[PDB]
Amino acid sequence: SGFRKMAFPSGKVEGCMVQVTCGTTTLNGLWLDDVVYCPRHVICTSEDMLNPNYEDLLIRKSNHNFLVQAGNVQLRVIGHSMQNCVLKLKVDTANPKTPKYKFVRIQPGQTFSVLACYNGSPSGVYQCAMRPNFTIKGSFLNGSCGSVGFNIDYDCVSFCYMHHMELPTGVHAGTDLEGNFYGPFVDRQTAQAAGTDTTITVNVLAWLYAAVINGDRWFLNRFTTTLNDFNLVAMKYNYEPLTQDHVDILGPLSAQTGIAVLDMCASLKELLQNGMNGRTILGSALLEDEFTPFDVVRQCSGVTFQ
Amino acid sequence: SGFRKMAFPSGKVEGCMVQVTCGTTTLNGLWLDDVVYCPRHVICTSEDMLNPNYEDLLIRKSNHNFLVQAGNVQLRVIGHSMQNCVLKLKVDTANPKTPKYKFVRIQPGQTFSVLACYNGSPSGVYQCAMRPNFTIKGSFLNGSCGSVGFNIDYDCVSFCYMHHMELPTGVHAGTDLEGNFYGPFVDRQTAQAAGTDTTITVNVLAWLYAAVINGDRWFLNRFTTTLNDFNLVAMKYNYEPLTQDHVDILGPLSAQTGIAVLDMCASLKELLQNGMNGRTILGSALLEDEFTPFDVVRQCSGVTFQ
Numbered sequence: 001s002g003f004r005k006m007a008f009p010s011g012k013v014e015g016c017m018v019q020v021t022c023g024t025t026t027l028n029g030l031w032l033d034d035v036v037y038c039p040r041h042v043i044c045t046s047e048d049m050l051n052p053n054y055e056d057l058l059i060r061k062s063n064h065n066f067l068v069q070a071g072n073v074q075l076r077v078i079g080h081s082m083q084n085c086v087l088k089l090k091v092d093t094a095n096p097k098t099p100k101y102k103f104v105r106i107q108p109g110q111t112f113s114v115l116a117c118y119n120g121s122p123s124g125v126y127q128c129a130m131r132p133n134f135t136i137k138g139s140f141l142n143g144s145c146g147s148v149g150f151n152i153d154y155d156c157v158s159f160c161y162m163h164h165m166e167l168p169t170g171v172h173a174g175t176d177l178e179g180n181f182y183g184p185f186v187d188r189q190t191a192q193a194a195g196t197d198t199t200i201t202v203n204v205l206a207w208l209y210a211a212v213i214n215g216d217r218w219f220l221n222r223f224t225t226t227l228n229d230f231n232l233v234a235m236k237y238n239y240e241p242l243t244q245d246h247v248d249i250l251g252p253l254s255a256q257t258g259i260a261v262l263d264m265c266a267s268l269k270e271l272l273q274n275g276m277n278g279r280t281i282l283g284s285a286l287l288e289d290e291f292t293p294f295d296v297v298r299q300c301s302g303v304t305f306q
Numbered sequence: 307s308g309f310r311k312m313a314f315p316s317g318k319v320e321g322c323m324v325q326v327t328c329g330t331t332t333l334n335g336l337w338l339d340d341v342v343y344c345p346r347h348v349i350c351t352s353e354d355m356l357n358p359n360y361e362d363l364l365i366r367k368s369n370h371n372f373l374v375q376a377g378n379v380q381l382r383v384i385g386h387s388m389q390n391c392v393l394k395l396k397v398d399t400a401n402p403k404t405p406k407y408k409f410v411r412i413q414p415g416q417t418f419s420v421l422a423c424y425n426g427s428p429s430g431v432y433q434c435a436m437r438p439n440f441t442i443k444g445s446f447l448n449g450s451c452g453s454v455g456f457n458i459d460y461d462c463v464s465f466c467y468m469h470h471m472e473l474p475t476g477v478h479a480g481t482d483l484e485g486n487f488y489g490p491f492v493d494r495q496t497a498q499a500a501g502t503d504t505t506i507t508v509n510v511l512a513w514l515y516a517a518v519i520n521g522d523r524w525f526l527n528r529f530t531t532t533l534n535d536f537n538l539v540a541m542k543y544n545y546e547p548l549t550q551d552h553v554d555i556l557g558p559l560s561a562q563t564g565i566a567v568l569d570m571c572a573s574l575k576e577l578l579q580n581g582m583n584g585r586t587i588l589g590s591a592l593l594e595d596e597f598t599p600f601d602v603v604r605q606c607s608g609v610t611f612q
Contacts, residue, residue: 001472004432004445010317121612125315126311139309214476302447302450
């Protein structure tokens with residue numbers, strides 16, 4: 001028993017991290033086979049930032065301008081291309097530590113592990129969610145660009161995020177590994193702001209089920225509610241609408257605990273209207289929304305990876 | 307910016323995890339050089355548990371009774387010994403992936419990363435603290451015994467915990483890697499209970515400094531307080547006494563933020579007496595105590611590891 005914000009083991013990803021230096025900018029890159037992936041704003045300079053034309057900036061570069069260090073071995077660039085907002089630097093050596101991998105573009109509400117890195121060296125690992133407003137609440141300092149987010153599925157690494165910038169509210173914005181930003185953000189220094197966020201309702205319900213599995217039950221009740229009547233309460237408290245598909249996904253957890261999904265919704269309803277009244281759930285005094293139904297099942301059942 | 311419960315990168319430890327099977331019991335072991343370390347209660351059987359004599363139980367074993375699998379390669383045991391509550395199984399192959407390492411016995415209040423494992427395969431990584439009552443609030447299911455906790459310091463892994471059991475309150479108890487339990491616990495099935503815990507005061511102050519570094523300031527005040535007068539309030543709310551040594555350790559954080567340590571204590575004092583009044587600190591509605599002063603400096607400054 002017990003329930004923790006758990007990240008995936010990071011080893012498979014650590015073996016892919018490299019340092020990319022161009023001009024006065026240094027950041028991280030991801031070395032898979034003979035390609036290094038990194039944010040395209042590495043070719044920018046501190047005066048280019050204002051409104052750059054990356055196509056013009058890249059045609060002006062030569063391979064030898066890209067300094068790629070994999071630990072203490074310095075990788076020679078033999079080619080370069082740009083796909084949306086990522087650079088792909090082709091190197092003459094394939095990474096022998098390349099895991100089985102996929103590039104996947106995730107939906108808001110889904111979670112992933114972030115391996116934060118500086119100068120090609122990992123600093124730490126933690127679990128994030130993609131907020132409904134397509135930011136992530138990370139921990140990122142100067143130099144962390146090119147750090148990736150990922151999930152693991154048995155032996156395969158699914159890369160889903162690479163870090164590009166921080167927004168004025170202190171939240172973070174980035175792309176998928178094919179370089180498409182999550183949300184409306186652009187790799188241009190302009191007025192950009194996160195936009196209104198909401199709470200990930202299906203995840204809160206998942207976490208309440210986690211609580212029941214682990215022996216917290218003070219928040220349950222005999223009441224029920226309808227999907228419609230629940231969603232009317234959710235909107236009042238800035239929660240995402242709950243879909244029938246969400247209800248279906250919460251099926252196994254409902255079956256393991258014997259608490260019908262719509263009964264758990266009646267419990268959330270009362271928690272939203274009454275607060276928690278000095279009590280805690282799974283060591284938290286707030287309703288937690290960065291655990292998916294999959295995360296809960298995974299941790300409460302013991303799935304592993306090779 | 308941002309502040310997260312961050313674990314160390316787990317790669318160095320993942321390469322050491324193995325499966326140890328003896329009789330009807332399966333659990334994890336730690337393979338460093340030509341030795342596999344694992345909890346001695348693997349030699350127990352479901353009727354031995356009541357009050358075992360491990361010296362008698364071990365003299366009765368042969369090397370071939372110990373089934374050690376390192377992935378898909380099955381390690382031959384050539385010797386076995388017992389050091390306190392751990393077994394050391396000597397194998398005929400040295401782990402080529404053995405990191406630089408040390409075994410260290412930590413103080414309560416110190417934090418570490420746990421790589422949770424089943425059948426020799428890692429499942430996830432998260433950050434724990436050693437509670438003042440020498441338990442840890444982990445996430446552990448059947449089969450997780452032998453999972454380790456660790457810190458990293460540049461390139462060296464300092465192993466500090468191996469998992470043995472769960473206590474009736476759902477918290478966890480274990481040993482250092484030399485097999486000495488943390489706290490009064492014994493690897494015997496009897497009436498054992500955690501005992502009263504307290505909040506790690508110096509860590510709460512560290513986390514308040516983290517908050518200031520990251521732009522949360524609503525809890526500050528112009529007041530101050532004396533060490534003595536602070537400790538009188540701490541005791542009322544079941545907080546650990548703050549020592550002058552704690553104050554000294556909080557020195558750099560005090561210097562970076564310009565908030566004298568005793569001023570931050572006056573802030574904690576008011577938070578304890580008034581609660582948070584609907585507000586949050588670093589996304590938490592509770593005072594958080596599982597970040598050390600070192601953890602805060604590390605994450606707010608960008609230290610890395612190879």
